[PDB]
Amino acid sequence: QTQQLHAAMADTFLEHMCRLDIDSPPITARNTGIICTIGPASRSVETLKEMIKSGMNVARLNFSHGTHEYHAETIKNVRTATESFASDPILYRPVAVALDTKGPEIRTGLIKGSGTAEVELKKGATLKITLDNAYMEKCDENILWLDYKNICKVVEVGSKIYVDDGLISLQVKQKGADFLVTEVENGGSLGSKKGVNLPGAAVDLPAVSEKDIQDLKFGVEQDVDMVFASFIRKASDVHEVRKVLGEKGKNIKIISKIENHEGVRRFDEILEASDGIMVARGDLGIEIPAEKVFLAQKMMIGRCNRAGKPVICATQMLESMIKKPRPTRAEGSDVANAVLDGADCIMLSGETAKGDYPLEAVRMQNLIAREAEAAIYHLQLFEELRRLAPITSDPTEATAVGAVEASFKCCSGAIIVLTKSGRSAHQVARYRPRAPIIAVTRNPQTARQAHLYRGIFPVLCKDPVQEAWAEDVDLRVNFAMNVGKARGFFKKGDVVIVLTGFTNTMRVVPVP
């Protein structure tokens, strides 16, 4: 048995589970994109190359920390590492750059003497919180300076406040005039500049602030491919982000992050306005009750899938791997279930940004994802997506559905799509074919953005535009055709699907 084809033949979803077999190997090609956060541990060109070698598709730069210089250098290294393989088109793996925005986050100040210094909060022990900037440099076990100045106006008496990943929780004994006197609920070591969450509270921090505008404009200067926009709450917040990106940045994909109750509620509004969604479980698990996350996640992946847009699952997928070389059984199951849910990309934060084993964590996700894709019940996924798919006037859309249906019949090895903007390829992916979609394009940016979609393998053709069109099409097709054989997606005999143009033509041919 190969790539769980026995499990795929069952009539029921239950029979399908029963036939899943651990002694049935997947198809080398992994379809779920891997997004790694680049930080102190993965920043070197040297380790960065190993990362690309291990499976990284997108590099995430977290702008809640670090100066532009720091990030501009990170960006340069990501590109040095990526172009190191440019010599040969069979080794060249396009890598995209994504910018995560700080956004409307509330942070505590610097602990006494220095941030490295720590402190311990013990239960019951009240604690003082002032917006008095004299204490920012002096954060201690008795006084905690906040970042959000117009706090109290939004926090009533009795409410809660979670500091540091929500690990530390407090309780407002009374709303002060310009200060708060709390009481630890469950202490712990309070370092410095630890995020703060005000669930139940109605924060008014600007969706996009000054710092966000400069970082956002910086991304346009830097030529990033996508923006992960933090704390999106309404469709109007995404518009401000497009606005800022201006005309120069109009092609940058915008990924709205859902991290709170409102965003969850205004999801439909937000999805329509975005290019894609990121299920940002970290904050969302503090903003709403932790047992609800799985529901918000499946709700979001389901709708994005249905809508044909990228959805990224993120935060704490391999937490444990920050300190250890192997993941726990919960984390192992986490990644698999995300892929099986329908997530286009899975992500890594601390695991690659500051952990001791970023390469093992990237390698782990390539492994799990590959297994998880083989275990997908397509006979039901494809049938369900079609039935829910609107009746179209667009030829390319009918070409896409027709192409994925043929790929299941002849069990095809690949769906070669020639596209300039990537749309044709995106249209093929929403129907979730089992065959890999090799997207041949001359646009290096659409090639990078291809990674936000499940099953799209971008192959950047450099060859000059042939004088004659028919020839230029035949050229880009032999390109995929040779790089494909070279990369091992198929051999001279295999049947393959090819989509060219406006993309409205489909051909089922033998590999040359």
Catalytic residue among 30, 60, 233, 309: 60
Which residues, including other chains, have CB under 8 Å from residue 249's CB and lie 6 or more apart? 216, 219, 220
Considering only residues 76 through 95, tell me which ones interact with its own copies, judged by CB under 8 A.
none
User: Which segments are annotated as binding site for ATP?
Assistant: 62-65, 107, 194
Q: Extract long-range pairs of 302-307: CB within 8 Å, 24+ residues apart.
A: 302/341, 302/342, 303/267, 303/268, 303/271, 304/271, 304/276, 304/277, 304/342, 304/344, 305/342, 305/385, 305/430, 305/432, 306/385, 306/388, 307/271
Closer to its own copies by Cβ: residue 22 or 177: 22
For tokens 């695991």, the residue is: 351
**Residue 383 is a binding residue for its own copies (CB under 8 A):** yes
Catalytic residue check, 107? yes
Q: Which of 196, 317, 347, 511 binds its own copies (CB under 8 A)?
A: 317
Closest approach of Cβ 62 to its own copies, in Å?
17
Catalytic residue check, 79? no
> CA torsion, points 79, 84, 88, 94, in degrees to nearest 10?
-30
Do residues 442 and 461 lie in contact, with contact meaning Cβ atoms separated by under 8 Å?
A: yes
**Residue 199 is a binding residue for its own copies (CB under 8 A):** no
Considering only residues 232 through 251, tell me which ones interact with its own copies, judged by CB under 8 A.
none
Closer to its own copies by Cβ: residue 59 or 428: 428
Catalytic residue among 30, 233, 253, 257: 257
**Residue 302 is a binding residue for its own copies (CB under 8 A):** yes
Considering only residues 343 through 382, tell me which ones interact with its own copies, judged by CB under 8 A.
357, 360, 364, 367-368, 370-372, 375, 379-381
Buried b (16+ CB within 10 A) or exposed e, 379-392: bebbeebeeeeeee
Residues in the chain: 512
Q: Which of 32, 37, 54, 169 binds its own copies (CB under 8 A)?
A: 169
Q: Tell me if residue 360 falls in helix, strand or coil.
A: helix
Closest approach of Cβ 153 to its own copies, in Å?
26
Closer to its own copies by Cβ: residue 46 or 405: 405
Q: Which of 102, 193, 303, 378 binds its own copies (CB under 8 A)?
A: 303
Of 486, 441, 481, nearest in space to 90 by CA: 486
Q: Which of 69, 202, 289, 464 binds its own copies (CB under 8 A)?
A: 289
Closest approach of Cβ 299 to its own copies, in Å?
4
203 is written with which tokens? 């924060």
Catalytic residue check, 60? yes
Catalytic residue among 315, 446, 500, 503: 315
Cα separation, 403 vs 396, whole angstroms: 10
Closest approach of Cβ 322 to its own copies, in Å?
10
Which stretch in 61-69, 207-215, 248-256, 283-291 sits in contact with its own copies by CB under 8 A?
Answer: 283-291
Considering only residues 388 through 447, tell me which ones interact with its own copies, judged by CB under 8 A.
388-389, 391-399, 401-403, 405-407, 409-412
Do residues 90 and 173 lie in contact, with contact meaning Cβ atoms separated by under 8 Å?
A: no
What are φ and ψ of residue 277, in 5° steps? Answer: -125, 150
Provide the residue type at 333 as one letter.
S
Closer to its own copies by Cβ: residue 208 or 418: 418
Which stretch in 28-36, 224-232, 292-300, 416-424 sits in contact with its own copies by CB under 8 A?
Answer: 292-300
Q: Give me the helix-helix angle, 329-341 and 358-374, nearest 10°.
A: 50
Site string for its own copies, 468-497 (x = CB under 8 A): ---------------------------x-x
Closest approach of Cβ 382 to its own copies, in Å?
10
> For 210-273, what is the HEC assignment?
HHHHHHHHHHHHHCCCEEEECCCCCHHHHHHHHHHHCCCCCCCEEEEEECCHHHHHCHHHHHHH
User: Which segments are annotated as binding site?
Assistant: 57, 60, 62-65, 93, 100-101, 107, 194, 257, 259, 282-283, 315, 419-424, 451, 469, 476, 502
Of 498, 512, 502, 501, nearest in space to 417 by CA: 498
- List the catalytic residues: 60, 107, 257, 315
